[PDB]
């Protein structure tokens, strides 16, 4: 089946709808937070 | 504090496993004495 996106205005397969809503609104500041959490982790000493 | 709490856990487990340590005869004697005392003094129970 095919469904219209309430977040993107595009047609998507019905099987990917749950993941499409789950990752179509992944807040980009989450990616920023993960980036700054990994940048500090790499620079950490022993 | 840690030692006393470990001992208290042991004591509570002993009470739970071994049941009440007051025999029914002793409890009945205590309760009867209290009842007789309250009846003698004419004590009205404290209401809600």
């Amino acid at each position: 089946e095919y469904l219209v996106s309430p977040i993107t205005g595009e047609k998507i397969p019905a099987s990917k709808m749950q993941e499409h809503m789950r990752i179509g609104l992944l807040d980009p500041r989450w990616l920023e937070q993960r980036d700054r959490s990994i940048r500090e982790k790499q620079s950490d000493d022993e | 504090t840690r030692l006393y709490l470990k001992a208290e856990q042991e004591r509570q487990h002993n009470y739970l496993k071994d049941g009440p340590y007051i025999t029914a005869e002793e409890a009945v004697a205590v309760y009867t004495t209290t009842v007789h005392w309250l009846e003698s003094r004419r004590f009205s129970p404290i209401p809600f």
Binding site: - | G19, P20, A24, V28, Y31, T32, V35
Partner: protein, 376 residues
Amino acid sequence: AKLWDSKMFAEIMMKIEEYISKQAKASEVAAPEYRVIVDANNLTVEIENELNIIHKFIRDKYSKRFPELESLVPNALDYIRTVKELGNSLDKCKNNENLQQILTNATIMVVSVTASTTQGQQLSEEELERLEEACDMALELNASKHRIYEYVESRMSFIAPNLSIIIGASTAAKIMGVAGGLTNLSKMPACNIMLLGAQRKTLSGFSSTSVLPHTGYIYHSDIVQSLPPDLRRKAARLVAAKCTLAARVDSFHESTEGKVGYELKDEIERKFDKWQEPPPVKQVKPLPAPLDGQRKKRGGRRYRKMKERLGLTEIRKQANRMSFGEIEEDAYQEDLGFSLGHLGKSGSGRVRQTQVNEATKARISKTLQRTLQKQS
């Protein structure tokens, strides 16, 4: 009357249906066996109803002798056994070896204590013999119920395979009998299955949590009891939901082998493993480095409110001012260090009394307001 009519009904049921159940049980040692399961599930309900009637009659008859034991012993079968053992003679209540099995040691003290201060008069010979015959009938009905439950346990490998896979056939039989049969248990919501066979145990001084309220066969089943006590209500809920799913599957005789039963049992085990999983590695947060320099902080309505709440108040300004040379009498006995200062004492320069800054009022947190909304 009602005691005799119930006896006639029990005899009529045992003559035909119980005999057929025994014959079907001993057969393996045009007359199918599914109808035998149906009429056995009817017998358990009939026996429960007539046992409730018998318990009502026994309680009514015994309220003349000991009118409190019904509240002290809430369970019907335990009440019947206790009234059978005690009877009119309450003198033998001391060191009742025969009562330790019927009642726990917590309520044995309660019944012994209450029996010493009971106003109920002794029964008569006719009342005693009627009560004894009623108790004997109740125990006979209980034995018949145990036999029919044994038969249902034997047949659960054939009637309810998925539900017997998820939970043991003993718990399977005990929930199927009390629910009124496989169809009635499958038409029952998952929240009502966990409460099947939940005896309203009377809290004997102890808290309600110690008595484990709202607990049934599922909770006391083998898989749920194989969990730490802090993780047993969640296990009971999950097992009840999966058992409801399995029962709904079985009521239509689908998945006879038990593919759905295993597909649910293995995910139950997976959830149990996930709950008991060791906690992951969490990095220790080091203390923040000591801070030097200037950091710009905003100001506004929030900052103004915070400063008003935290800033010095006039009465709290007078509190930390002590007159020089004017020795004051000690105010608070428990703490001699405590002193009002210029508050209420001459020399403060204020003719009128300082008023309370209402911005420093103490009030509950936001989340503590939420609890009050869930309490009233």
